[PDB]
């Protein structure tokens, strides 16, 4: 059944699993037409498919061409997500195929279940966790590869950089969720915290800066303060 606070350690056990977030698959700008009506223009999107144990990120770029001449796009986006995740599982060797796929939005359950009928032993699960994976497009290098795509493309990343050389998956996932939660609550402030010290750079093969263990504690503190500051604004408490 549903993944929650109670069964959280299950994310970091040795059973292969993937999170699938469809938030950024169908993306539009809303604008006025010449006649003063409203229309949308699609921009490139992405499926965010993540192994929370290894940090392996399967970023399937959704090019605006996949929407051309299609109707009910927000519905189609769920099915195209399910199609691409099914295609990704079939592309993996059997011993790399997930035993579970956790969808961040309940509306993905039926589309993914129907696309995965060929895999009856892969459990499709919702989560009660409110995960901030919508903020993936606030990671500059992920945003850059999505916007520059001229065709459908899969790009492979490790969303934890080299962190697992020093910390456990549990701690790496907690750092990732805190960074993404901050970027989601106040993107400008979060990016300011991450790049304020020019001496700390992002390696060409990394997503995040090369912080020492001590600098990560300071960064993590600054992110928690940002989240509480913002919370005391939303609610005035």
């Amino acid at each position: 059944g549903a993944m929650n606070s109670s069964n959280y350690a299950e994310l970091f056990n040795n059973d292969i699993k993937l999170f699938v977030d469809d938030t950024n698959v169908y993306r539009v700008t809303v604008h006025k037409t010449f006649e003063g009506n409203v229309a949308t223009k699609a921009i490139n999107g992405c499926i965010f498919t993540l192994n929370p144990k290894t940090g392996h990120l399967f970023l399937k770029i959704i090019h605006t061409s996949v929407w051309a001449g299609q109707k009910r796009l927000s519905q189609l986006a769920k099915w195209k997500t399910a199609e691409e995740v099914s295609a990704l599982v079939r592309s993996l060797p059997k011993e790399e195929q997930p035993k579970q796929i956790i969808v961040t939005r309940k509306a993905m359950l039926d589309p993914l279940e129907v696309h995965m009928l060929d895999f009856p032993n892969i459990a499709i699960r919702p989560t009660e966790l409110r995960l901030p994976f919508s903020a993936a497009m606030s990671i500059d290098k992920l945003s850059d590869v999505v916007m520059k795509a001229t065709e459908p493309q899969m790009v492979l990343f490790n969303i934890y950089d080299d962190w697992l050389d020093r910390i456990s998956s549990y701690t790496a996932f907690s750092r990732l969720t805190l960074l993404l939660r901050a970027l989601k609550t106040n993107e400008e402030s979060a990016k300011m915290i991450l790049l304020s010290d020019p001496t700390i750079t992002i390696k060409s093969y990394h997503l995040w800066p090369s912080f020492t263990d001590e600098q990560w504690i300071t960064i993590e503190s600054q992110m928690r303060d940002l989240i509480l500051t913002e919370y005391g604004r939303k609610y005035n408490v």
Partner: protein
């Protein structure tokens, strides 16, 4: 007009014959039911006064043999049996009729209710859903599970309804996942109608039989099957016009006949709301929508 004699009535019991029912007292001189209309299946059903649990009964067609009921004190139920001796049977019935120890199948001449509930139901189809090939009649009760319910435990006592599963390889063509899930026309028309049922009459016969088992025995699995077969039609964008018009009539008589007090347990809110208000066929079931809105507006 055919007769089902009873040897005796040793235990107090409510007896149903199709949509009618009669209370019989312990050792009441009851010897059966006469004037049963030829040309339809019938169901004779029982609920003991001392254990209202296990409604049970027998589907039969008097054209297929001479049937009688006899209480079995060992198995503790009223059993249907076939009398192979024609003259013995005619002599039993004539005696009981002469002594007027039989109730008359109380059909009002204007009333097409039973025809309308059993229009497509054929004994030969019942005998494939309820497998006991040594008898020409079919036993059903409250507790019998379906082949589908057993998949998700005694196979000899199962209801072998056609398995319908919207999230199954049978229901979904590879490469048409979204299309086949949101529009079930290929599942209805190619898999079920052309493939398994061969024609709409057999499909309707099974739908009608599932409803009747749900209503007469409170058979939960039958109720699931009745709703699945309705939902498969209402969720198909492409259905022959004759099937939609016939479905509206079928469902109208089923909703008309259902005891008002059993809507809570025999009607699935989700299926009916979806079928009448959201589905492709939301505007194709005028008679059913009108009787449902006037009789069960709470459910909707």
């Amino acid at each position: 007009m055919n007769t089902v004699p009873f040897t005796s009535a040793p235990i107090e019991v409510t007896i149903g014959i199709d949509q009618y029912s009669f209370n019989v007292k312990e050792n009441q001189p009851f010897h059966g039911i006469k004037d049963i209309p030829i040309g339809h299946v019938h169901v004779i059903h029982f609920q003991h006064a001392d254990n209202s649990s296990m409604r049970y009964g027998y589907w039969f067609d008097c054209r297929m043999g001479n049937f009688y009921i006899q209480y079995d004190p060992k198995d503790g139920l009223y059993k249907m049996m076939e009398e192979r001796d024609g003259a013995k049977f005619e002599n039993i019935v004539h005696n009981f009729k002469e002594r007027q120890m039989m109730v008359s199948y109380p059909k009002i001449d204007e009333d097409d209710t039973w025809y309308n509930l059993t229009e497509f139901v054929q004994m030969d189809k019942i005998r494939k859903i309820v497998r006991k090939d040594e008898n020409q009649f079919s036993y059903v009760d409250s507790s019998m599970t379906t082949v589908q319910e057993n998949e998700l435990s005694d196979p000899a006592h199962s209801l072998n309804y056609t398995v319908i599963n919207f999230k199954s390889r049978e229901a979904i063509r590879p490469g048409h996942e979204m299309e086949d899930f949101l529009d079930k026309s290929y599942y209805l028309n190619t898999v079920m109608l052309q493939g398994i049922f061969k024609n709409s009459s057999n499909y309707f016969g099974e739908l009608q039989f599932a409803f009747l088992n749900a209503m007469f025995f409170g058979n939960y699995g039958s109720s699931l099957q009745w709703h699945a077969m309705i939902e498969l039609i209402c969720s198909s964008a492409t259905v022959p016009k004759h099937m939609l018009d016939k479905l509206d009539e079928i469902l109208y008589y089923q909703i008309k006949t259902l005891p008002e007090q059993y809507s809570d347990i025999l009607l699935n809110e989700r299926v009916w709301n979806i079928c009448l208000y959201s589905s492709f066929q939301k505007n194709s079931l005028h008679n059913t929508e009108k009787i449902m809105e006037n009789k069960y507006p709470e459910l909707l």
